[PDB]
Amino acid sequence: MNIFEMLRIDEGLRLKIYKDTEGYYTIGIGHLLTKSPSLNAAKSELDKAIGRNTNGVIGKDEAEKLFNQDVDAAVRGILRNAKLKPVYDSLDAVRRAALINMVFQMGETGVAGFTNSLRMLQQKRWDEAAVNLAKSRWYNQTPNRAKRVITTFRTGTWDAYK
């Protein structure tokens, strides 16, 4: 198991514009297109992102390409973030994947806001951090995905994904 396969399980793959759990226009592997309600503003972003007139539909290769960019951007945002970097540096390889997963889903800003959990992760207090992470809209809104990520943090293994 690796970050890519982990996120692929969590986000799925859709080759036509769809709406995410929050109601936003998305495509491929969890690639947010716009928060705007307009399907046309979504097709426009889509075409800008792909470099061709897509008519709302892409191929597998195109989806995977967006996904590669997105993981890369997630990692780089963590490394540039003053709150996130120290956490990431302190963690083992599996737990690093779990932090990347949160950032891919909620953005650097959102994760950076989990102040207390971040401090517990840094201190390696696994069980306590798992408890604190659960008291979030995040866990309340996407409980099955949140539990998987949380278990990854608590245990340090890929169990929840096997």
Our CB check for Cl ion shows the closer of 49 and 121 to be 49
The residue from 81, 136, 142, 155 that contacts Cl ion (CB under 5 A) is 142
Q: DSSP alpha helices (H): ranges in the chain?
A: 3-11, 39-50, 60-80, 85-90, 93-112, 115-122, 126-134, 137-141, 143-155
- Would the annotation count 132 as a binding residue? yes
Rounded to 5°, the CA angle 61-62-65 comes to 85
Contact 145, 12 (CB under 8 A): no
Site membership for Cl ion, residue 151 (CB under 5 A): no
Our CB check for Cl ion shows the closer of 35 and 124 to be 35
Contact 80, 68 (CB under 8 A): no
- Would the annotation count 32 as a binding residue? yes
* Residues 13-52 interacting with Cl ion (rule: CB under 5 A): 49
Which residue among 10, 11, 70, 108 is the active-site one? 11
- Would the annotation count 13 as a binding residue? no
Q: Which burial class, exposed, middle or buried, applies to 76 when counting CB atoms under 10 A from its CB (0-12, 13-18, 19+)?
A: exposed
* Alpha-carbon distances, residue 74 vs 7, 106, 156 (angstroms): 12, 10, 20
Least distance from C-beta 115 to Cl ion, angstroms? 24
- Would the annotation count 104 as a binding residue? yes
Least distance from C-beta 89 to Cl ion, angstroms? 27
Does 20 qualify as catalytic in the annotation? yes
Sites of contact with Cl ion (CB under 5 A): 49, 142, 144-145
Q: Annotated catalytic sites, by residue?
A: 11, 20
Residues of each annotated binding site: 32, 104, 117, 132
